[PDB]
């Protein structure tokens, strides 16, 4: 049923994933079919290398990669049976640990184009940061916002191992022309960065 959702490790690290019938483990890389890695809790499937193992620490099933290799960053799924039913776990993505990087923040006012059809989308971009965890907050003339913004986040960059994140404030055109100052705030840890613009400048 359940597994630790997200994991950062380095090449060389020892890595252990947990799962809530004996379990089978599958590996999936983006855009490819899953492969079977471990069946019957602890049996290595054909061609799977030896740094992989499985175990039952108490009542939970584990998969261990004793020494993580570049080709091992992927998603991992455990799979059980119950009656005539089969179920896969939520999945666990194993990501590349890397040095902390501050996002460069860009704020974009709605285009004149979008405005003159009566909608206002303000777009905040956090670019090339690590780790993934951040808190975004929209400000409109200094009043914080709620219920009117959405967020989305890229997978890890294949070059630098960073993430990017977009946040979109959707306002009516009218609610937009009523106000002057627009700011999104990015908190990561002890640092909190605000970027803004004055409408019409």
């Amino acid at each position: 049923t359940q597994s630790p959702s997200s994991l950062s490790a380095s090449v060389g690290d020892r890595v252990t994933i947990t799962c809530r019938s004996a379990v089978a483990w599958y590996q999936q890389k983006p855009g490819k079919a899953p492969k079977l890695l471990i069946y019957s809790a602890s049996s290595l499937y054909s061609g799977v290398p030896s740094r992989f193992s499985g175990s039952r620490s108490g009542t939970d099933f584990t998969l261990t990669i004793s020494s993580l290799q570049p080709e091992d960053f992927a998603t991992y799924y455990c799979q059980q049976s119950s009656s005539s039913l089969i179920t896969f776990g939520q999945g666990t993505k194993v990501e590349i640990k890397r040095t902390v990087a501050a996002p460069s923040v860009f704020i974009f006012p709605p285009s004149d184009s979008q405005l003159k059809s009566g909608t206002a989308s303000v777009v905040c971009l956090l670019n090339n940061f690590y780790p993934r965890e951040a808190k975004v907050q929209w400000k409109v003339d200094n009043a914080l916002q709620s219920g009117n913004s959405q967020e989305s986040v890229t997978e890890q960059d294949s070059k630098d191992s960073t993430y990017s994140l977009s946040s979109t404030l959707t306002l009516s055109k009218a609610d937009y022309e009523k106000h002057k100052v627009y700011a999104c705030e990015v908190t990561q840890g002890t640092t909190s960065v605000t970027k803004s613009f004055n409408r019409g400048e």
Partner: protein, 225 residues
């Protein structure tokens, strides 16, 4: 020397019907079960159904029990999934995988053979309504160091839309966000790129939005405001 090959599927209206194929080569067919496993875009795997030799040996998950039907023909070593009553949550990539003939019977605290061989997958998407996207510029924030510019791809349905920059010529520094579903029931995303501020007056930046569900291509020139 064992293969599963998948086929059929793609675009259908909800309240339509579609039939997936899994033709298998390189092994004694009747000694195994064939399973269907689907994965919604950017989501986990979901076991759907299986069948063995004897056609009484079938089962389905609670999400598809009455809407789908699994069959098999041992004459040619193929197996089918007929899908009916096609709601939204049916849009997914659909794999077929091979397991043991008596997997249910063998299932125990120490045993689980899992599914060894898998097909390449086939995309199945149900387009209830269709809207093409509007595209608006995210105009360069500065004029120097680095500048960020982008395209807001807005109010389309259903997924997905692809985004290139300069028709594939610019790829470095590009970030295309996964779409979000707005409260309006329409999808939206942004694509951005970072470039050197000094190229703003000498280089052109166009974003290319493609939306197959509506056969729309939008090309948008992002200029400094």
């Amino acid at each position: 020397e064992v293969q599963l090959v998948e086929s059929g599927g793609g675009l259908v209206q909800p309240g339509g019907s579609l039939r997936l194929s899994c033709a298998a080569s390189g092994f004694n067919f009747s000694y195994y079960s064939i399973h269907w496993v689907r994965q919604a875009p950017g989501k986990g795997l979901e076991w759907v159904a299986y069948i063995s030799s004897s056609s009484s040996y079938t089962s389905y998950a609670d999400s598809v029990k009455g809407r789908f039907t699994i069959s098999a023909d041992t004459s040619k070593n193929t197996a089918y999934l007929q899908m009916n009553s096609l709601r939204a949550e049916d849009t997914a990539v659909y794999y077929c995988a091979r397991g043991y003939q008596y997997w249910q019977y063998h299932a125990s605290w120490y045993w689980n053979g899992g599914l060894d061989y898998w097909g390449q997958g086939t995309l199945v998407t149900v387009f209830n309504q269709i809207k093409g996207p509007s595209v608006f510029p995210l105009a360069p924030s500065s004029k120097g160091g680095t500048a960020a510019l982008g395209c807001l791809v807005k109010d389309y349905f259903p997924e997905p839309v692809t985004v290139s920059w300069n028709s594939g010529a610019l790829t470095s520094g590009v970030h295309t966000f996964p779409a979000v579903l707005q409260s309006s029931g329409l999808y939206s995303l942004s694509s951005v790129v970072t470039v050197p501020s000094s190229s703003l007056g000498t280089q052109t930046y166009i974003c290319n939005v493609n939306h197959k569900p509506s056969n729309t291509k939008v090309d948008k020139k992002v200029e400094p405001k």
